[PDB]
């Protein structure tokens, strides 16, 4: 009936060659070949448009049909060229992009375009079901072209019926894709919506002649019938007559590097750290400069200089495990797992969103409750035990050669390994120099080195996930730390003996008995919620409450300890890698005064201590001790210790805290909603509504702690044992990954057998895990030594790292030293040990009963012998499970 319905009717009536003639007829395109080579390789620093949209926004803004500023929201970001051209715009200060991705559709692409430090993209977002947020610049490139206009209209109508909820929160500028602007109902809806919110409709000539797509933009204004008739008229005319020529233009060059950002960081205490700062400038004043494009909000930018890049994102496959696990070639949770990006880029694109935050300063009443509980806990812990200066002897006793250098200055660049340095008196001479400087109150060398951690983690966007940062000091600074405070890890201040709540050292075997004994305790439900990024939530108040143990020290120990505390913990200086613009990489040096590193000696101890303080505070709030105004200021300060010395240990042995993670069994169910002191301290719950009640649990077998839930199993004879478990796909993926680049197959099979014996030792109750471990240990030479690390948990001591038989190892760890199993009778055979329940094994990620696992299990000897043949025959193998 209309100029558009008739044009679309003609466009459908054509054939494939008339289609090809008309599609590109008379528009402008972009010289996209440069950008598409940089994308073929993945060259982020090239600074090219990831899409053709970058030019559509370039045109819509540069012609002046858009007035972009402030906080931007890209709806349907797809790759993200719109978001990436937004990051370049001067008045923009944060760009949020949302997309769906997944199967078939476009996952977000990560580049180094100018301003990449303000770009947060997510996938798996059906935006119709996303709530509204008040953005300053609204972007919607969400359209879905088709042959029949009946679905074009409905899809644009659903698109608008969604974006209106967003637009009624008044953004300053907008650009929304309009796929069908040419039908009766669409003309009606466009007129009514232009009246109710403003704006104007523009057709872009870069856009193909094959869709009626127009854009609803802010800085422009025009009538709907007029612009639509303009577009349909011109489209109808370009069909007949001359096939008119294409106009070439060049793609917008986005640039590269970070962007100048809000710097609301606290001023530095210059005289604590100035020695180290000016030492670094005196050492690297050659290329010393200040980059204005620091993407640091909560860190004090102190400068940068050129440096070499470290790490990679490449992930190699362990073919032993993979070829033996051919049926897991399908599960996404297994094959999508890979390595973590430890490059400067991969470290910073996690840094700018996980570390560049500033904690709310808890109120003084919560501050006083924190200090009260911390002092009471220092008293109750330092009751039996008392501090002591750790010795250089114990330091070299615990040390081994696989530690990290921390090579910062020229005086520390001699050695290559740890054991090489520990027996050289020049080392202890510089240590004594820094110790006497610490006693005088000046820090020269205690500087933090930082980079991303190499982890075996789930892949995101079908790519390598960004690496969480780890930052450690110089071994001499770690020695000063140890002589001051390492007594907390040495003397087991956190062991369940002295504390009651902690479990410092206890392996994953006994912890299930701790859970059973805690479940036998009556009360409410069991509440175990992980804390979001523990190290980043630590405040100065938490640190100053931790510095209280010094009350029980002597004068020299307290001098060294408080010197290191104040010059190291309460004042931190860091050296990090950052990808500079156009290839080059730089090292920046920054500073702050709160949070804590995972590279500290007493990381586990400090995490467990402040976590227990918080749990005590939450049990006080749950059991109504702390009133609602007491966040502001403390009323009746006595009744805090009145409850501490009446129920402190009583509620304390109902706790299991291990650094980051925690488990509590309170008195009643109110613990689920005692969240106000918890939120005020800066210790929020990870990815759950900040005020929603906590999810409790009843059956202790289904409680997670340190990535494991435990199960009780009766033996085939009668004894009762408690075993750890997690999802099978995670362990299979971790084993499938090879951490190292360039390792010989001998050592890769060493890792294969390491994982194999780890499974035989821990996850034997999983049918596939024991089966595959027997198969790996079979096809792998029992000669070679297991090397490498499996799971980074400190509760994994490393018991499967020997060619000794796992049956004997099993008897020793589960019966002879089993403190919670009295019967010392060692069972003699493998198949006497029971599996997990059929249903519970299937639930924890097992593939039993399915035809691929059946097929692979019947050809197991074929495949294992294939493995032996590939390694190299006439090596000493062993045919482990036969039944
Ligand atoms: N409902 C939805 N929510 C989020 N993303 C969607 C979506 N529907 C489609 N998408 C994705 O968003 C893309 C829209 S085109 C993306 C253009 C982008 N703004 C640019 O800068 O060039 C599609 O490829 C599709 O995969
Ligand atoms: Zn120092
Ligand atoms: Zn389980």
Author numbering: 6 to 888
Task: Quote the study's own text.
One attractive candidate is NS5, responsible for the catalysis of the 5’-RNA capping, methylation and RNA synthesis, during flavivirus genome replication. It comprises an N-terminal S-adenosyl-L-methionine (SAM)-dependent methyltransferase (MTase) domain and an RNA-dependent RNA polymerase (RdRP) domain at the C-terminus. The C-terminal RdRP domain adopts the canonical right-hand polymerase fold, consisting of fingers, palm, and thumb subdomains, with the catalytic GDD motif located in the palm and a long priming loop protruding into the active site cavity.
Two different crystal forms, orthorhombic P212121 and hexagonal P65, were obtained, containing six independent NS5 molecules in each asymmetric unit. Despite the limited resolution (4 Å and 4.8 Å resolution for the P212121 and P65 crystals, respectively), the resulting electron density maps not only showed a perfect fitting of the two molecular replacement models but also allowed the tracing of bulky side chains, as well as the ten amino acids linker (residues 263–272), joining the MTase to the backside of the RdRP domain in four out of the six molecules of the asymmetric unit. Anisotropic diffraction was observed, particularly in the P212121 crystals and correction was applied during data processing. The high solvent content of these crystals (80% and 77% for the P212121 and P65 crystals, respectively) significantly helped to improve the maps using density modification. Extra difference densities were also seen in the SAM/SAH binding pockets to accommodate the ligands in identical positions to those previously reported, although none of these compounds were added to the crystallization solutions. The crystallographic asymmetric unit of both crystals consists of three dimers (named AB, CD and EF in P212121 and A’B’, C’D’ and E’F’ in P65 crystals), in which the monomers are related by pseudo-twofold molecular axes. Each monomer contributes >1200 Å2 (30% of the total surface) to the dimer interface. Dimer-dimer interactions (Interface II) are also conserved in both ZIKV NS5 crystal forms and involve contacts between molecules B-C and D-E (P212121 crystals) and B’-C’ and D’-A” (P65 crystals, with A” corresponding to a symmetry related A’ molecule). Three distinct NS5 regions are implicated in interface II contacts, burying >1000 Å2 of surface area between monomers in each pair.
